[model samples]
Target: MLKQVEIFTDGSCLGNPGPGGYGAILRYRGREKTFSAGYTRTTNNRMELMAAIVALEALKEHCEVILSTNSQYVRQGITQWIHNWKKRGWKTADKKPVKNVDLWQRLDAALGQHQIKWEWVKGHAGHPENERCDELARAAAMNPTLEDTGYQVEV
Candidate 1:
């Protein structure tokens, strides 16, 4: 039987365009797997998107996913805005290029691999999973950075 997985994700940045990091926790049955990574220079939105991307990518088999995030950018972008963005050729409603298109594209591809139900949780509001993710994200951001090729290419 396919197990249902619950994932919670969060991101943190020292500055708006400074070092950033993402955290994700995936729970299946009684087991939990956590992931985190830091980027040299990136935006919070990018890290937020990356958290979900990394969590989804970790799945080796098709499973029902309950993905919770404190970021509306990640949740709404996937569940609501992505279709129209694709239809518009990755442009925004204003006809401008979408920010973080690379990550968004990656996330779109990842979504095709699973059955997901997106959930939004309030950040730092005593949600255990979300709070834990936030801690992990902040700690990662303070660590040595890794290359963010996407951000480097765009900026």
Candidate 2:
């Protein structure tokens, strides 16, 4: 058995590349906090990654962490492929450039601050905490308030 901080996070987007948002709920010692933010132009994946970073960054001290999310990309990237990607100059197996190294890089930094177990859950499911995260994400997406400054515009 292990003890750790708990957080659930989710992200939403109006389109593949459109207004978006990220949300997270943190719990520690029976106290909880909620966070969410919107972007004028971003991706679902971006928000997903941001959600994790936001909660991790929000943490006040280094501690063991359990972060749950619906995105496999986030789990896979951090758990399995990130090391290979880094060795490949942040390139994927297809020899293609990683589209979000900026966020990944930031994640790399945030990750070193704690020991985290990234948990994946099916989306649109009936889990209360997970669903609440989705609601926060969707709500923020619907009320986008800031620009995604780092978003790369395709030529």
Top model by TM-score, which number? 1
Q: 30, model 2: CA deviation in Å?
A: 3.0
* Cα RMSD, each candidate: 2.3, 2.7
Residue pairs in collision within model 2: none
Candidate 2 lDDT, tens digit per residue, 21-60?
Answer: 9889998657789999999989988899998888888877
Which stretches of candidate 2 lie above 4 Å from their native place?
Answer: 1-3, 92-97, 123-126
Q: Which tens-of-lDDT digit does each residue in 1-155 have in candidate 1?
A: 44789999999998877888988999966788999989887888989999998999888888899988889788678678889888889976677778888899998898998899877776446378888889899989998368777874343
Query: What C-alpha lDDT values do all the predictions have?
Result: 0.85, 0.84
Model 2 lDDT vs. the true structure? 0.84
Which regions of candidate 1 fall more than 4 Å away from where they truly are? 93-96, 123-126, 152-155
lDDT (Cα) of model 1 = 0.85
